[PDB]
Amino acid sequence: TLHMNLIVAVDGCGGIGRNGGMPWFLPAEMARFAKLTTLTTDSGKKNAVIMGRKVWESIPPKFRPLKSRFNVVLSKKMKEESNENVVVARSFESAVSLLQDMENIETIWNIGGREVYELGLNSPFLHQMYITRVEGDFLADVFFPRVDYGRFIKSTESEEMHEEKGIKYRYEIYTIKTDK
Ligand SMILES: COc1ccc(CC(=O)O)c(NC(=O)c2ccc(Cc3c[nH]c4nc(N)[nH]c(=O)c34)cc2)c1
């Protein structure tokens, strides 16, 4: 059993990116992102993160590859990465096949790029979406894919509002109905 979960923070318009970077800076939100994508049930197993090239380029090089996770970067243009914690994959199919061959990978966390999310939303491994809903319009130029939330069951745990730097947000968790 290999789950692919999507994790994203979207604003009120569904925007995720602006000028190649994040439209906001939310340290507590990103700390939770780090915990969700890193922590495993089986110790000595690892999670993988799959991302597009522009997500990769948006991470400060001092934090690349993302620590304690196996990084897969989708790109047709990037040269191969010598670091053993990151592999450049030339297609979504080859990335997922490489990850399911690795027995020490517990969960695949799809951390986007719009096209990477879209492919995740069509993957047989699709399990959950962890969506941070940020209040307001941050004038994004890249957006989360159009998704049919009717495909999913929204979890009903209590979810409070959060605020940092005057920016408000709420967490949501969705499970594909065929799982459930
Ligand atoms: C190597 O160890 C480190 C050290 C320091 C940091 C913090 C920092 O670099 O500032 C990190 N973390 C990141 O680098 C990071 C990675 C991806 C993104 C975008 C992203 C995708 N998907 C999302 N989903 C939600 N919910 N929120 C998001 O913010 C995103 C945002 C931040 C890792």
Side-chain angles (χ1 to χ4, degrees), residues 1-61 63-66 68-75 77-179:
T1 65
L2 180 62
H3 292 155
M4 181 178 297
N5 297 336
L6 280 58
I7 183 162
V8 69
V10 307
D11 75 6
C13 303
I16 61 168
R18 176 176 166 91
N19 292 325
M22 298 286 293
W24 49 74
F25 173 65
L26 302 169
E29 208 274 338
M30 284 185 294
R32 171 180 181 269
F33 164 97
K35 297 196 188 80
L36 279 171
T37 58
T38 303
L39 294 180
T40 65
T41 303
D42 183 351
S43 56
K45 271 192 190 161
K46 237 184 197 185
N47 291 328
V49 285
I50 180 165
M51 74 193 88
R53 165 182 58 86
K54 297 179 186 180
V55 167
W56 173 262
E57 295 183 336
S58 74
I59 304 165
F63 297 162
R64 261 152 36 184
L66 293 178
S68 316
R69 291 146 287 183
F70 185 62
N71 296 44
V72 181
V73 188
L74 295 172
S75 182
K77 303 183 174 76
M78 278 182 68
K79 303 170 173 117
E80 301 185 357
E81 290 279 334
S82 55
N83 190 306
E84 65 183 354
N85 293 305
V86 46
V87 59
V88 176
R90 304 304 179 184
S91 68
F92 193 80
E93 183 239 351
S94 53
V96 177
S97 162
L98 160 71
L99 291 175
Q100 58 185 308
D101 280 357
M102 301 170 57
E103 325 211 65
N104 66 316
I105 296 301
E106 182 168 287
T107 302
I108 303 172
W109 282 92
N110 184 320
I111 68 169
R114 172 174 189 156
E115 180 178 353
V116 184
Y117 287 136
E118 174 91 29
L119 289 158
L121 288 167
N122 284 297
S123 170
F125 287 132
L126 176 66
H127 181 48
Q128 285 182 317
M129 299 189 299
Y130 289 73
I131 298 171
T132 300
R133 212 154 294 268
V134 179
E135 284 192 7
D137 176 359
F138 285 80
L139 308 171
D141 52 30
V142 175
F143 297 81
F144 194 67
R146 307 280 187 155
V147 62
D148 179 10
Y149 291 96
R151 301 170 61 200
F152 300 86
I153 301 295
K154 187 190 202 321
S155 294
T156 51
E157 81 288 346
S158 299
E159 288 295 355
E160 76 281 19
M161 196 199 77
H162 308 247
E163 180 162 2
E164 332 179 50
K165 338 262 168 173
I167 299 172
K168 299 176 166 113
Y169 57 93
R170 191 175 324 256
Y171 300 135
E172 310 178 345
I173 299 172
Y174 297 87
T175 308
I176 196 73
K177 277 180 175 173
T178 48
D179 286 1

PDB file of all heavy atoms in Angstrom, residues 106-128:
ATOM      1  N   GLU A 106       7.724   5.235   2.402  1.00  0.00           N
ATOM      2  CA  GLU A 106       6.446   4.951   3.044  1.00  0.00           C
ATOM      3  C   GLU A 106       5.278   5.675   2.376  1.00  0.00           C
ATOM      4  O   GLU A 106       4.260   5.053   2.053  1.00  0.00           O
ATOM      5  CB  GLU A 106       6.514   5.316   4.529  1.00  0.00           C
ATOM      6  CG  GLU A 106       5.238   5.008   5.290  1.00  0.00           C
ATOM      7  CD  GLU A 106       5.424   5.090   6.786  1.00  0.00           C
ATOM      8  OE1 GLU A 106       6.067   4.183   7.360  1.00  0.00           O
ATOM      9  OE2 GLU A 106       4.937   6.068   7.384  1.00  0.00           O
ATOM     10  N   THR A 107       5.401   6.982   2.169  1.00  0.00           N
ATOM     11  CA  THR A 107       4.353   7.775   1.540  1.00  0.00           C
ATOM     12  C   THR A 107       4.996   8.720   0.534  1.00  0.00           C
ATOM     13  O   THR A 107       6.125   9.178   0.733  1.00  0.00           O
ATOM     14  CB  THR A 107       3.548   8.577   2.586  1.00  0.00           C
ATOM     15  OG1 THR A 107       2.974   7.680   3.545  1.00  0.00           O
ATOM     16  CG2 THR A 107       2.422   9.385   1.932  1.00  0.00           C
ATOM     17  N   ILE A 108       4.277   9.000  -0.554  1.00  0.00           N
ATOM     18  CA  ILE A 108       4.688  10.000  -1.535  1.00  0.00           C
ATOM     19  C   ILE A 108       3.914  11.279  -1.259  1.00  0.00           C
ATOM     20  O   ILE A 108       2.679  11.286  -1.306  1.00  0.00           O
ATOM     21  CB  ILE A 108       4.441   9.526  -2.975  1.00  0.00           C
ATOM     22  CG1 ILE A 108       5.164   8.207  -3.244  1.00  0.00           C
ATOM     23  CG2 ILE A 108       4.879  10.611  -3.970  1.00  0.00           C
ATOM     24  CD1 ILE A 108       4.806   7.594  -4.580  1.00  0.00           C
ATOM     25  N   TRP A 109       4.627  12.364  -0.979  1.00  0.00           N
ATOM     26  CA  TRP A 109       4.002  13.666  -0.777  1.00  0.00           C
ATOM     27  C   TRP A 109       4.192  14.496  -2.043  1.00  0.00           C
ATOM     28  O   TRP A 109       5.317  14.845  -2.404  1.00  0.00           O
ATOM     29  CB  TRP A 109       4.574  14.366   0.455  1.00  0.00           C
ATOM     30  CG  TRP A 109       4.000  13.804   1.738  1.00  0.00           C
ATOM     31  CD1 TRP A 109       4.522  12.796   2.500  1.00  0.00           C
ATOM     32  CD2 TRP A 109       2.781  14.202   2.382  1.00  0.00           C
ATOM     33  NE1 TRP A 109       3.708  12.547   3.582  1.00  0.00           N
ATOM     34  CE2 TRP A 109       2.636  13.399   3.537  1.00  0.00           C
ATOM     35  CE3 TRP A 109       1.807  15.165   2.103  1.00  0.00           C
ATOM     36  CZ2 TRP A 109       1.551  13.526   4.407  1.00  0.00           C
ATOM     37  CZ3 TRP A 109       0.726  15.289   2.969  1.00  0.00           C
ATOM     38  CH2 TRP A 109       0.608  14.475   4.107  1.00  0.00           C
ATOM     39  N   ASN A 110       3.084  14.801  -2.710  1.00  0.00           N
ATOM     40  CA  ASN A 110       3.087  15.603  -3.931  1.00  0.00           C
ATOM     41  C   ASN A 110       3.005  17.068  -3.514  1.00  0.00           C
ATOM     42  O   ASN A 110       1.979  17.511  -2.997  1.00  0.00           O
ATOM     43  CB  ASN A 110       1.916  15.183  -4.821  1.00  0.00           C
ATOM     44  CG  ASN A 110       1.891  15.892  -6.166  1.00  0.00           C
ATOM     45  OD1 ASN A 110       2.174  17.084  -6.269  1.00  0.00           O
ATOM     46  ND2 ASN A 110       1.524  15.150  -7.207  1.00  0.00           N
ATOM     47  N   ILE A 111       4.095  17.812  -3.704  1.00  0.00           N
ATOM     48  CA  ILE A 111       4.197  19.177  -3.205  1.00  0.00           C
ATOM     49  C   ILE A 111       4.112  20.178  -4.347  1.00  0.00           C
ATOM     50  O   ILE A 111       4.462  21.347  -4.193  1.00  0.00           O
ATOM     51  CB  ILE A 111       5.465  19.379  -2.363  1.00  0.00           C
ATOM     52  CG1 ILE A 111       6.723  19.294  -3.222  1.00  0.00           C
ATOM     53  CG2 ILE A 111       5.510  18.332  -1.257  1.00  0.00           C
ATOM     54  CD1 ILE A 111       7.982  19.744  -2.505  1.00  0.00           C
ATOM     55  N   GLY A 112       3.664  19.714  -5.492  1.00  0.00           N
ATOM     56  CA  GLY A 112       3.146  20.588  -6.478  1.00  0.00           C
ATOM     57  C   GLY A 112       4.161  21.164  -7.420  1.00  0.00           C
ATOM     58  O   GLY A 112       5.245  20.623  -7.661  1.00  0.00           O
ATOM     59  N   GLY A 113       3.829  22.381  -7.828  1.00  0.00           N
ATOM     60  CA  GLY A 113       3.708  22.762  -9.201  1.00  0.00           C
ATOM     61  C   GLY A 113       2.313  22.383  -9.672  1.00  0.00           C
ATOM     62  O   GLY A 113       1.858  21.266  -9.404  1.00  0.00           O
ATOM     63  N   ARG A 114       1.622  23.283 -10.377  1.00  0.00           N
ATOM     64  CA  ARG A 114       0.262  22.986 -10.822  1.00  0.00           C
ATOM     65  C   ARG A 114       0.194  21.691 -11.625  1.00  0.00           C
ATOM     66  O   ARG A 114      -0.664  20.838 -11.373  1.00  0.00           O
ATOM     67  CB  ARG A 114      -0.291  24.144 -11.650  1.00  0.00           C
ATOM     68  CG  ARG A 114      -1.635  23.802 -12.295  1.00  0.00           C
ATOM     69  CD  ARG A 114      -2.260  24.984 -13.000  1.00  0.00           C
ATOM     70  NE  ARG A 114      -3.623  24.658 -13.408  1.00  0.00           N
ATOM     71  CZ  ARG A 114      -4.580  25.550 -13.617  1.00  0.00           C
ATOM     72  NH1 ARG A 114      -4.356  26.846 -13.491  1.00  0.00           N
ATOM     73  NH2 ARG A 114      -5.798  25.126 -13.954  1.00  0.00           N
ATOM     74  N   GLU A 115       1.082  21.529 -12.615  1.00  0.00           N
ATOM     75  CA  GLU A 115       1.007  20.331 -13.449  1.00  0.00           C
ATOM     76  C   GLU A 115       1.286  19.069 -12.640  1.00  0.00           C
ATOM     77  O   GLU A 115       0.727  18.007 -12.935  1.00  0.00           O
ATOM     78  CB  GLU A 115       1.973  20.428 -14.632  1.00  0.00           C
ATOM     79  CG  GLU A 115       1.917  19.191 -15.543  1.00  0.00           C
ATOM     80  CD  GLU A 115       2.834  19.266 -16.756  1.00  0.00           C
ATOM     81  OE1 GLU A 115       3.445  20.330 -16.996  1.00  0.00           O
ATOM     82  OE2 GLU A 115       2.936  18.245 -17.475  1.00  0.00           O
ATOM     83  N   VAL A 116       2.120  19.170 -11.603  1.00  0.00           N
ATOM     84  CA  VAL A 116       2.408  18.010 -10.764  1.00  0.00           C
ATOM     85  C   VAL A 116       1.188  17.643  -9.922  1.00  0.00           C
ATOM     86  O   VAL A 116       0.861  16.460  -9.762  1.00  0.00           O
ATOM     87  CB  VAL A 116       3.645  18.290  -9.894  1.00  0.00           C
ATOM     88  CG1 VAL A 116       4.029  17.061  -9.078  1.00  0.00           C
ATOM     89  CG2 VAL A 116       4.806  18.732 -10.777  1.00  0.00           C
ATOM     90  N   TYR A 117       0.492  18.649  -9.381  1.00  0.00           N
ATOM     91  CA  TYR A 117      -0.772  18.397  -8.689  1.00  0.00           C
ATOM     92  C   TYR A 117      -1.789  17.745  -9.616  1.00  0.00           C
ATOM     93  O   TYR A 117      -2.474  16.787  -9.233  1.00  0.00           O
ATOM     94  CB  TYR A 117      -1.350  19.703  -8.148  1.00  0.00           C
ATOM     95  CG  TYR A 117      -0.649  20.287  -6.945  1.00  0.00           C
ATOM     96  CD1 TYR A 117      -0.379  21.646  -6.879  1.00  0.00           C
ATOM     97  CD2 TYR A 117      -0.290  19.490  -5.866  1.00  0.00           C
ATOM     98  CE1 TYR A 117       0.244  22.200  -5.776  1.00  0.00           C
ATOM     99  CE2 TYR A 117       0.329  20.032  -4.757  1.00  0.00           C
ATOM    100  CZ  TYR A 117       0.596  21.388  -4.721  1.00  0.00           C
ATOM    101  OH  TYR A 117       1.217  21.939  -3.628  1.00  0.00           O
ATOM    102  N   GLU A 118      -1.928  18.282 -10.830  1.00  0.00           N
ATOM    103  CA  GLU A 118      -2.915  17.755 -11.768  1.00  0.00           C
ATOM    104  C   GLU A 118      -2.670  16.279 -12.049  1.00  0.00           C
ATOM    105  O   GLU A 118      -3.612  15.476 -12.077  1.00  0.00           O
ATOM    106  CB  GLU A 118      -2.880  18.567 -13.064  1.00  0.00           C
ATOM    107  CG  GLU A 118      -3.764  18.012 -14.172  1.00  0.00           C
ATOM    108  CD  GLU A 118      -5.164  18.586 -14.153  1.00  0.00           C
ATOM    109  OE1 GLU A 118      -5.321  19.741 -13.701  1.00  0.00           O
ATOM    110  OE2 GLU A 118      -6.106  17.886 -14.593  1.00  0.00           O
ATOM    111  N   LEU A 119      -1.404  15.901 -12.245  1.00  0.00           N
ATOM    112  CA  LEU A 119      -1.077  14.497 -12.473  1.00  0.00           C
ATOM    113  C   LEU A 119      -1.347  13.661 -11.231  1.00  0.00           C
ATOM    114  O   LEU A 119      -1.810  12.520 -11.332  1.00  0.00           O
ATOM    115  CB  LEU A 119       0.383  14.367 -12.900  1.00  0.00           C
ATOM    116  CG  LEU A 119       0.684  14.889 -14.306  1.00  0.00           C
ATOM    117  CD1 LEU A 119       2.159  15.224 -14.459  1.00  0.00           C
ATOM    118  CD2 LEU A 119       0.265  13.857 -15.342  1.00  0.00           C
ATOM    119  N   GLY A 120      -1.054  14.209 -10.050  1.00  0.00           N
ATOM    120  CA  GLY A 120      -1.397  13.512  -8.821  1.00  0.00           C
ATOM    121  C   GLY A 120      -2.890  13.275  -8.692  1.00  0.00           C
ATOM    122  O   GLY A 120      -3.322  12.217  -8.233  1.00  0.00           O
ATOM    123  N   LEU A 121      -3.698  14.245  -9.121  1.00  0.00           N
ATOM    124  CA  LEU A 121      -5.146  14.092  -9.014  1.00  0.00           C
ATOM    125  C   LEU A 121      -5.696  13.034  -9.958  1.00  0.00           C
ATOM    126  O   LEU A 121      -6.869  12.669  -9.829  1.00  0.00           O
ATOM    127  CB  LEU A 121      -5.840  15.422  -9.279  1.00  0.00           C
ATOM    128  CG  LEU A 121      -5.681  16.449  -8.163  1.00  0.00           C
ATOM    129  CD1 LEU A 121      -6.111  17.821  -8.654  1.00  0.00           C
ATOM    130  CD2 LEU A 121      -6.499  16.008  -6.949  1.00  0.00           C
ATOM    131  N   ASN A 122      -4.883  12.533 -10.889  1.00  0.00           N
ATOM    132  CA  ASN A 122      -5.299  11.482 -11.809  1.00  0.00           C
ATOM    133  C   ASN A 122      -4.568  10.169 -11.567  1.00  0.00           C
ATOM    134  O   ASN A 122      -4.706   9.239 -12.369  1.00  0.00           O
ATOM    135  CB  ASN A 122      -5.094  11.935 -13.258  1.00  0.00           C
ATOM    136  CG  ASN A 122      -6.156  12.903 -13.715  1.00  0.00           C
ATOM    137  OD1 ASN A 122      -7.333  12.559 -13.772  1.00  0.00           O
ATOM    138  ND2 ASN A 122      -5.747  14.122 -14.048  1.00  0.00           N
ATOM    139  N   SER A 123      -3.804  10.066 -10.482  1.00  0.00           N
ATOM    140  CA  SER A 123      -2.973   8.910 -10.174  1.00  0.00           C
ATOM    141  C   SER A 123      -3.763   7.861  -9.395  1.00  0.00           C
ATOM    142  O   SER A 123      -4.516   8.205  -8.480  1.00  0.00           O
ATOM    143  CB  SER A 123      -1.759   9.323  -9.352  1.00  0.00           C
ATOM    144  OG  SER A 123      -1.070   8.185  -8.863  1.00  0.00           O
ATOM    145  N   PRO A 124      -3.596   6.580  -9.723  1.00  0.00           N
ATOM    146  CA  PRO A 124      -4.217   5.527  -8.898  1.00  0.00           C
ATOM    147  C   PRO A 124      -3.744   5.544  -7.457  1.00  0.00           C
ATOM    148  O   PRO A 124      -4.421   4.984  -6.588  1.00  0.00           O
ATOM    149  CB  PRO A 124      -3.803   4.225  -9.602  1.00  0.00           C
ATOM    150  CG  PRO A 124      -3.354   4.637 -10.969  1.00  0.00           C
ATOM    151  CD  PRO A 124      -2.835   6.032 -10.857  1.00  0.00           C
ATOM    152  N   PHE A 125      -2.599   6.160  -7.174  1.00  0.00           N
ATOM    153  CA  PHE A 125      -2.088   6.216  -5.813  1.00  0.00           C
ATOM    154  C   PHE A 125      -2.683   7.354  -4.998  1.00  0.00           C
ATOM    155  O   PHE A 125      -2.435   7.411  -3.788  1.00  0.00           O
ATOM    156  CB  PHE A 125      -0.567   6.340  -5.839  1.00  0.00           C
ATOM    157  CG  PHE A 125       0.134   5.075  -6.231  1.00  0.00           C
ATOM    158  CD1 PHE A 125       1.130   5.088  -7.190  1.00  0.00           C
ATOM    159  CD2 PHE A 125      -0.200   3.871  -5.637  1.00  0.00           C
ATOM    160  CE1 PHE A 125       1.778   3.919  -7.551  1.00  0.00           C
ATOM    161  CE2 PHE A 125       0.448   2.702  -5.994  1.00  0.00           C
ATOM    162  CZ  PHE A 125       1.439   2.731  -6.955  1.00  0.00           C
ATOM    163  N   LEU A 126      -3.455   8.246  -5.624  1.00  0.00           N
ATOM    164  CA  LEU A 126      -4.060   9.375  -4.925  1.00  0.00           C
ATOM    165  C   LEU A 126      -4.805   8.922  -3.675  1.00  0.00           C
ATOM    166  O   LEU A 126      -5.655   8.028  -3.729  1.00  0.00           O
ATOM    167  CB  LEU A 126      -5.027  10.107  -5.856  1.00  0.00           C
ATOM    168  CG  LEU A 126      -5.791  11.255  -5.197  1.00  0.00           C
ATOM    169  CD1 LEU A 126      -4.820  12.361  -4.803  1.00  0.00           C
ATOM    170  CD2 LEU A 126      -6.864  11.781  -6.119  1.00  0.00           C
ATOM    171  N   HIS A 127      -4.495   9.561  -2.550  1.00  0.00           N
ATOM    172  CA  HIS A 127      -5.105   9.182  -1.280  1.00  0.00           C
ATOM    173  C   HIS A 127      -5.787  10.379  -0.630  1.00  0.00           C
ATOM    174  O   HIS A 127      -7.020  10.444  -0.552  1.00  0.00           O
ATOM    175  CB  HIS A 127      -4.042   8.590  -0.351  1.00  0.00           C
ATOM    176  CG  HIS A 127      -4.580   8.143   0.972  1.00  0.00           C
ATOM    177  ND1 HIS A 127      -5.709   7.362   1.087  1.00  0.00           N
ATOM    178  CD2 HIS A 127      -4.141   8.361   2.234  1.00  0.00           C
ATOM    179  CE1 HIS A 127      -5.947   7.122   2.364  1.00  0.00           C
ATOM    180  NE2 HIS A 127      -5.011   7.718   3.080  1.00  0.00           N
ATOM    181  N   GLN A 128      -4.989  11.340  -0.180  1.00  0.00           N
ATOM    182  CA  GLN A 128      -5.491  12.491   0.552  1.00  0.00           C
ATOM    183  C   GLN A 128      -4.962  13.794  -0.039  1.00  0.00           C
ATOM    184  O   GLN A 128      -3.926  13.829  -0.708  1.00  0.00           O
ATOM    185  CB  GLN A 128      -5.121  12.404   2.041  1.00  0.00           C
ATOM    186  CG  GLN A 128      -5.965  11.397   2.807  1.00  0.00           C
ATOM    187  CD  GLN A 128      -5.621  11.343   4.286  1.00  0.00           C
ATOM    188  OE1 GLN A 128      -4.451  11.344   4.673  1.00  0.00           O
ATOM    189  NE2 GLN A 128      -6.647  11.292   5.119  1.00  0.00           N
TER     190      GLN A 128
END
